[PDB]
Design a protein around this ligand. Structure first.
Ligand SMILES: Nc1nc2c(ncn2[C@@H]2O[C@H](COP(=O)(O)OP(=O)(O)O)[C@@H](O)[C@H]2O)c(=O)[nH]1
Ligand SMILES: [Mn+2]
Length: 380
């Protein structure tokens, strides 16, 4: 198999460790690191490369991402450049992706995936336990969107649609490299694209569970995620009129109980997030609210004077979602900030009226949210 780690600003030690793990694995026949730019990490890898290759019998290659798409040049270009290398410069039967910044990586990751592929699945997705205030894009944007737009489909049932850890059969990779909507998505929307398209094409999917969780880079306040938020919402938006094919087999490994350290983690700085809600206002944003339902309009307007979020419950979010699908303009600075504030109030609502009632309570809620969304959408 080919194992790929795409990287941007990672520390060298962290990535080289993971490369060492993959290179040591009996089933891995090459590893490719795909860099955003040539930096300290890129060079570090390049010189450790031929030395790891002889100690293991596995070639390791570094390469720059190239401009294959047309949105922000970001992770998409990275993964697609990797697709091209896999498909055009090698004859390997399978391709693995794993985020570069993982600190809990081990060979069972690889093993579990390969075995599932042996079992016959076209695509294998690693999923993990996550803290109840993490994954807020995943739930509030990606899964919610898939549920509101494609209720009868397998799409909202994917556990981790933004997740970067996965394995594909060659033909699946080829199919994806050849799909214009996929190639286009050079920014953060790549994972959403791979998820959507593999499902839509009737690829057979297995989601295997990694109990240890994903130890990666940590994040402080909510606006760390702002670009990602817009790009991820954009991705859904652009798919909104697509149609989905007959589904294949979709099965998911049963999840273990959550590590205590994970159930006990807090995803963001509440104070700072409340502060941020009252910032970066413009008259244009205030006028743009006129597009929204009264409680959302009035809700968000209050945020100019003081933080408000009780209004942003599950129904209000769905209504807000429909307006955004219709009027949101990627590239528009005001729409971008409005989406951010708006998502922000949803997260806070969820944090105080759900996450605070406890981990299990939150998880049960989130799944029931999707359920209710799926059911509402299929009546209209
Ligand atoms: N090649 C490439 N890799 C990227 C880019 N942006 C992010 N990455 C990598 O994609 C993976 C996910 O990035 P990260 O910020 O840690 O994702 P997150 O944990 O979900 O917030 C990591 O391996 C990053 O190094 C990019 O523009 N190009
Ligand atoms: Mn990460």
């Amino acid at each position: 198999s080919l194992v790929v780690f795409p990287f941007k600003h990672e520390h060298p030690e962290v990535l080289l460790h993971n490369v060492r793990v993959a290179a040591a694995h009996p089933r891995v026949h090459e590893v490719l690191c795909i860099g955003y730019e040539r930096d300290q990490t890129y060079e570090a890898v390049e010189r450790a490369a031929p030395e790891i290759s002889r100690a293991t019998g596995t070639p390791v290659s570094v390469r720059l991402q190239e401009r294959l798409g047309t949105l922000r040049p970001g992770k998409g270009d990275g993964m697609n450049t990797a697709l091209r290398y896999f498909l055009e410069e090698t004859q390997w039967e399978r391709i693995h992706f794993y985020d570069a910044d993982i600190t809990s990586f081990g060979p069972d990751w690889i093993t579990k995936a390969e075995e599932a592929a042996d079992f016959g699945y076209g695509l294998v997705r690693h999923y993990f336990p996550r803290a109840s205030t993490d994954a807020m894009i995943t739930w509030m944007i990606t899964r919610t969107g898939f549920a509101l737009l494609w209720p009868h489909t397998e799409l909202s049932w994917i556990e981790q649609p933004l997740g970067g850890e996965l394995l594909m059969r060659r033909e699946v990779a080829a199919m994806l490299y050849e799909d214009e909507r996929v190639r286009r998505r050079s920014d953060w929307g790549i994972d959403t694209l791979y998820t959507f398209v593999t499902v839509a094409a009737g690829v057979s999917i297995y989601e295997c569970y990694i109990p240890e969780g994903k130890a990666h880079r940590l994040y402080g306040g909510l606006d760390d995620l702002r670009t990602m938020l817009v790009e991820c919402f954009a991705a859904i938006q652009s798919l909104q009129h697509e149609v989905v094919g007959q589904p294949a087999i979709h099965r998911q490994e049963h999840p273990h109980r959550v590590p205590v350290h994970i159930a006990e983690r807090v995803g963001y700085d509440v104070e700072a997030t409340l502060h941020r809600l009252m910032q970066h206002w413009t008259p244009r944003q205030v006028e743009l609210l006129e597009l929204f339902t009264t409680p959302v309009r009035e809700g968000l307007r209050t945020c100019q004077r003081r933080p408000a979020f009780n209004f942003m419950d599950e129904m209000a979010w769905a209504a807000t979602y429909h307006v955004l699908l219709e009027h949101f303009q990627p590239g528009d600075p005001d729409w971008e900030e409005l989406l951010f504030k708006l998502w922000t109030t949803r997260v806070l609502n969820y944090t105080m009226t759900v996450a605070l009632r406890g981990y299990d309570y939150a998880q049960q809620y989130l799944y029931r949210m999707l359920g209710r969304y799926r059911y509402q959408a299929a009546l209209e």
